[PDB]
Each structure stands twice: as structure tokens, then as C-alpha cells.
Design a protein around this ligand. Structure first.
Ligand SMILES: COc1ccc(CCS(=O)(=O)NCC(=O)NO)cc1
Ligand SMILES: [Ca+2]
Ligand SMILES: [Ca+2]
Ligand SMILES: [Ca+2]
Ligand SMILES: [Zn+2]
Ligand SMILES: [Zn+2]
Length: 158
């Protein structure tokens, strides 16, 4: 499928969920990115202005693509694969309740999953993998990518 063909990649948080403190959304998204840079040659940067490769968006219902959101539960988030414009963009369902912990939907673990997509990974059938399609909360201090995840992204990059 598509990969990014360059090492320096940008992201930009477009708008912030009301559910969390600002610095907490910044930190969840930054930490999620680091999970992928730790196993690839890529370098990520947050830019606050203008066009970014990966636009991080909180939205609800119909929000301008063809992957309409479905109220609370169901579709937690989605993302598009590498490419320009909407390519790489990750959208988070604001009808969910975003958290740092386990009440509601953990933003950090969802963003790790979505960035997986943003970078060109499809889903894995391995339950152990972050790219498995079902959300399950684990203490984010204990989160590690499965060997499956590592084997997929290193197939794509580096
Ligand atoms: C292991 O951690 C996670 C695994 C999956 C999910 C998202 C599940 S989803 O939104 O309900 N399914 C849509 C989808 O695949 N969009 O990307 C979040 C975290
Ligand atoms: Ca939903
Ligand atoms: Ca984009
Ligand atoms: Ca919300
Ligand atoms: Zn969308
Ligand atoms: Zn997914």
C-alpha cells in the first residue's frame, strides 16, 4: 500500500476534545507518535500552523469524508493511509469520552492504533497487537507493541 517516502514527518492537532485537559491531549498524541518513531527511521514534529502531513481531528457524525461517525461506542476513530491532502489524517469520534486512564476511551492507545493506519498498516488478527481491530484498555505504562506490530512497520519502513 502507500508508505511515506521521506523521514521528517509533521503532524498538527486541529482541535481539542472538551473531555481532556489540553496538555493531556498534547501528551497522549506525542507519546503515541514516539511509539512508532522508536521502531522506525521516521522523525515526527508538531507544527501549530499550516499544512501538516498528519492532521489530528476530533469530530462527530458526518464530518466531511465518507467515514461518518456513529454516536458513542462503535467506531472509536479512523485514519487514512499515507498520501497528500486527507492522506495520513486521523479523526477521533468526539461522541466518545477521551481520557488519560481507563474510564471512557483512552486517547493514547487509540492514537497509537490510528497512527499505525496513518503510516500504512492495515489490521492484524493477532489479539496481542495494537493493530488488532478491537479496543482494550491496558495501563499505558505497560503498553508494548506486539512482535506482529514491529514486523509490520519494519516491513514498511527502515
Ligand atoms: C488495541 O487498541 C485499539 C484497537 C482498535 C481501536 C479502534 C477500534 S474501532 O474504532 O472501533 N474500529 C475502527 C478502526 O479500526 N479505525 O481505526 C482502538 C484502539
Ligand atoms: Ca462511536
Ligand atoms: Ca494529510
Ligand atoms: Ca467527547
Ligand atoms: Zn473522518
Ligand atoms: Zn483501525
Amino acid at each position: 500500500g502507500p508508505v511515506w517516502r521521506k523521514h521528517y514527518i509533521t503532524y498538527r492537532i486541529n482541535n481539542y476534545t472538551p473531555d481532556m485537559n489540553r496538555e493531556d491531549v498534547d501528551y497522549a498524541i506525542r507519546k503515541a507518535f514516539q511509539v512508532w518513531s522508536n521502531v522506525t527511521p521516521l522523525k515526527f514534529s508538531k507544527i501549530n500552523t499550516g499544512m501538516a502531513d498528519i492532521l489530528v481531528v476530533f469530530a462527530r457524525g458526518a464530518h466531511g469524508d465518507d467515514h461518518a461517525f456513529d454516536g458513542k461506542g462503535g467506531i472509536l476513530a479512523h485514519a487514512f493511509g499515507p498520501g497528500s491532502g486527507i492522506g495520513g489524517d486521523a479523526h477521533f469520534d468526539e461522541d466518545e469520552f477521551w481520557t488519560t486512564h481507563s474510564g471512557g476511551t483512552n486517547l493514547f492507545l487509540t492514537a497509537v492504533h490510528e497512527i499505525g493506519h496513518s503510516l500504512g498498516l492495515g489490521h492484524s488478527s493477532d489479539p496481542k497487537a495494537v493493530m488488532f481491530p478491537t479496543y482494550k484498555y491496558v495501563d499505558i505504562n505497560t503498553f508494548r507493541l506486539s512482535a506482529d506490530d514491529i514486523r509490520g512497520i519494519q516491513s514498511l519502513y527502515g
